Ligand binder design. Structure first.
Ligand SMILES: [Cl-]
Ligand SMILES: [Cl-]
Ligand SMILES: [Cl-]
Ligand SMILES: [Cl-]
Length: 35
């Protein structure tokens, strides 16, 4: 997958990164540090 967020990054919160796999893998790969 591409190393970009795919929703506005203000929604890529610490809470979502920590507690949601879909946010880590689909929506917020860059901001969550996934890639
Ligand atoms: Cl994939
Ligand atoms: Cl990548
Ligand atoms: Cl949140
Ligand atoms: Cl899920």
């Amino acid at each position: 997958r591409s190393c970009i967020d795919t929703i506005p990054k203000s929604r890529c919160t610490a809470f979502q990164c920590k507690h949601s796999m879909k946010y880590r893998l689909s929506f917020c790969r860059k901001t969550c540090g996934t890639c």
